Design a binder for this molecule. Sequence first.
Ligand code: HEM
Ligand SMILES: N[C@@H](Cc1c[nH]c2ccccc12)C(=O)O
Ligand SMILES: [C-]#N
Length: 381
Amino acid sequence: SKEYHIDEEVGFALPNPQENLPDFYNDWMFIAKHLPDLIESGQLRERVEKLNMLSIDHLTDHKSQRLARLVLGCITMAYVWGKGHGDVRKVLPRNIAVPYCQLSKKLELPPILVYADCVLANWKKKDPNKPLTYENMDVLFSFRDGDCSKGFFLVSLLVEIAAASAIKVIPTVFKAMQMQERDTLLKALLEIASCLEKALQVFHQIHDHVNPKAFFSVLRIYLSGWKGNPQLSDGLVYEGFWEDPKEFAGGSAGQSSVFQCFDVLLGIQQTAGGGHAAQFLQDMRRYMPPAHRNFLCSLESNPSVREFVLSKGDAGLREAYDACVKALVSLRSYHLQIVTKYILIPASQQPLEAKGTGGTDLMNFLKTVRSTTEKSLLKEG
Ligand code: HEM
Ligand SMILES: N[C@@H](Cc1c[nH]c2ccccc12)C(=O)O
Ligand SMILES: [C-]#N
């Protein structure tokens, strides 16, 4: 669909994003491309403060603006967190803060590195003739040496793309409901379950390409933001553009449109009830590109797939619907095994509730979200 910016091959991911900006923005591009050296050297904060206020008017198209958001995003995280020890800047310089805020307001995103920046736009194809696989792909920007950002962002991207194979089946589902096509609806649901099952298998790759200790103690702090964060409790002031400190949540796959959309499709009311988990998942829609925010909107306006399946007294159709719900439970149960390996165990090894980069009480949050998904199982009900 061209209206919602959903690619046939890669879904919500930005298809074939640009690898370089125009020569007017070469000051920006140099800093972002050598973050591993400049942060380790300890001269990044000096280089950002001593830099001119470049204008956003020269960026012609969407892909250039998204690359600029990624460049400015990675820079802003590197500036604020620094080496990642404790010395954090609570104020972003006017020369970098103003254009980045204006670029963010143009794309209707917040001025912080989001999922759409560091995963959906932060990749390339080595050889265009070869298919989309880990060995044939590479990220555009990293933070540190040995941070496993290549493995992390690409395995994240590959799961997106796998799960996004079920997006093209969604028009078939609602058309089948409108026309009362039982066999088509059942086949479409089983196909969606199959894509979500394959997304879980693609998740297994994370164990090969990402080291837990590297992830937890190096990379994870550069994905953290400044909403519900003791290190920047009042917020982060943007010099020139805003008056008071402004709070924005750090990045997470809570900001992914694909996993939020299957909860909506299947009638799993994650964003209902007024609890803290519902609040986060609804709030993270502000951190998605406006077209994907519009897609989740369009999806919610359709009649309930759940209500349709429950009314028919049809064991095959219930089972097909349940395959999709089971597949989301499996995915989230496995995601919690990843959380145990990559957050909990590393955290216990270093010398009250643990916070995610997105800013949630992660164990309560994730187990609530899974529990809500488990509640939607029919079990031939
Ligand atoms: C090292 C890898 C990963 C870790 C440590 C991790 C950890 C977490 C944490 C702590 C949250 C809670 C939100 C926050 O406050 O930040 C979260 C949310 C989420 N993560 Fe991950 N995550 C990882 C990779 C992935 C991958 C590959 C996916 C792919 C499907 C995924 C899907 C989600 C989703 C969908 C949410 C939102 C809550 C939900 O719908 O279940 N994550 N993750
Ligand atoms: N929220 C995760 C980090 C994470 C996983 N996937 C992401 C995608 C984008 C940004 C951050 C992430 C954590 O607390 O460890
Ligand atoms: C996943 N954050």
